[PDB]
Symmetry: C2
Subunit: 325 residues, 2 copies
């Protein structure tokens, strides 16, 4: 009645925000049974994102005895690619000392070949459809893999999904896609593959919880917060998250963003504590045109848009989770 863990799959695209989300899920086995991860070649190069996924899985397996799980590289291709400079992060993370602990390298080298054989889209479909319990899918990259599953399997897939918790969009606030060919109204995850986003968000047979910029822009990650990880440096997960957040805040200074934001980590937070935000049912359009507003998600089935997330609850959740090991 409150004592069972949720069955979860992480469908991610391999950047620092995606891995904070991953750590949040995997560090909390009382609440979350992580049965698979999918990596997409969007905010990463897929080979690097795959390797970092595998190292984190192996480290947690060693330290807290969380189960191993299948990991699959999606063959989904971009409609609009992420900026090249942004996609090298997973490569950089795979050189970090906390991801090269000798036992973790040894176990991942052993498990990598069996996971190499997986097709990411098909793995998502298979894990959901064979599962005894309904599955929560946490989507922190684009919606291409979910769209593929709906297209190929329809209700045979959707009837086994509990809900889809998604990072994407911008409803009542500005977007973050700033290119010579865009108007700044779209958000990146949607812009990467707008028709996929439309297929998923408009499907009445899947419940979508949407963390758009409306919510995620209210949870900045600042220097004063990043520096809190030093007090917990004895824990591997605090080394990892501290480092990743430090790297992220630096990126936003270099890119002249107002701030770095929790972004993807909020989807995972919601799965762990669904009172962290309130939900507004909203009908959305998804702009799939080739105009300046491609990928826009303006107000127009109801999508459930996360509103007003608790900064304090998020902070408490991240700091407790990163003391797990």
């Amino acid at each position: 009645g409150s004592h069972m863990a949720k069955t979860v799959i992480l469908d991610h695209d391999g950047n620092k925000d995606d891995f904070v989300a991953m750590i949040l899920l995997l560090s909390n086995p009382k609440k979350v049974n992580l049965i698979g991860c999918i990596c997409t070649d969007a905010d990463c190069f897929v080979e690097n994102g795959f390797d970092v996924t595998g190292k984190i899985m192996c480290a947690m397996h060693r330290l807290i005895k969380t189960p191993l799980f299948p990991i699959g590289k999606s063959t989904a291709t971009a409609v609009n690619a992420f900026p090249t400079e942004w996609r090298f992060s997973a490569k950089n993370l795979d050189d970090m000392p906390f991801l090269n602990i000798v036992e973790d390298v040894a176990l991942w080298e052993k498990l990598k070949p069996e996971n190499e054989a997986h097709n990411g889209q098909q793995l998502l479909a298979d894990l959901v459809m064979k599962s005894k319990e309904k599955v929560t899918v946490c989507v922190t990259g684009p919606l291409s893999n979910m769209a593929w599953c709906i297209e190929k399997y329809g209700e045979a897939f959707t009837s086994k999904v509990e809900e889809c918790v998604i990072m994407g969009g911008a409803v009542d606030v500005g977007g973050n896609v700033f290119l010579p060919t865009t108007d700044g109204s779209a958000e990146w995850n949607i812009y990467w593959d707008p028709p996929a986003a439309k297929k998923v968000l408009c499907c009445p047979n899947i419940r979508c919880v949407l963390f758009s910029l409306d919510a995620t822009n209210t949870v900045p990650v600042r220097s004063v917060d990043v520096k809190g990880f030093g007090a917990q440096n004895q824990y591997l997960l605090s080394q990892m998250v501290g480092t990743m957040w430090a790297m992220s805040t630096h990126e936003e200074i270099l890119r002249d963003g107002d701030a770095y934001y929790a972004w993807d980590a909020l989807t995972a937070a919601y799965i762990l504590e669904p009172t962290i935000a309130t939900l507004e049912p909203v009908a959305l359009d998804v702009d799939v045109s080739k105009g300046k507003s491609e990928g826009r998600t303006p107000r127009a089935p109801c999508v459930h848009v996360a509103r007003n997330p608790s900064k304090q609850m998020f902070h408490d959740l991240v700091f407790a989770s990163t003391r797990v090991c």
Copy 2:
């Protein structure tokens, strides 16, 4: 015996690897001060990182505390702005926010704020009982100031000056619309300062130019080696810094990240790491396309042929110290 050393640096990842190498080897090096210049960093951030590393090593291995001074030297030609934020980033890293180190630095910072960096360099060298080796990993401005103000009263107490700078027989690395690519950054930042120091017969200069440094790349396969040593704070520090460095050269399309400043400190620890060629240099101090160039023309001693294996061994041994 230990050599008495000062580090005159400008606050980026290569400077801090050099610092770690010096400070982790008290049997060989007595580090009596550090100077930070507002060149490849913003000086306030470079100052704070210097302090935190000092405090961490004091805590872990009981190395002495020492004065740290911010130089007020100003750039002739500033480093690219986007490169200068590294020290700020490092000061957010968890290995530099261990609570005891933060606390000790908050106590010691105000006493060091009073120091003028140029004057501190002069004062430390001139009051030292032994002759001092100055390890210069940023621009030559502070050494030039000391020579200008105090002349032989200063230089007569310098054992030798070990400097990161120049490119003699190879191309440079200063790529701007107003340059030809023949000059190296440390020299370009302040060419007249470099000319004053390199051309002074009364100071013995050991010069690590791109000729030497570009033969000692830092590659992924190497950086990953720090994982085996992650229980050591210095390995978390150097591993992370080199990971960050190799990333920067990917983004910037460099052929590789290079040891750079870390080789000067390596040389102080093991002088057989490289051979030395005596060479007369010119320093181009004009405003032309070749500003800052150090072409063959007193003899400067140019490092040649540094041992990659010795360097690797030294860095890995040093980062298992704590």
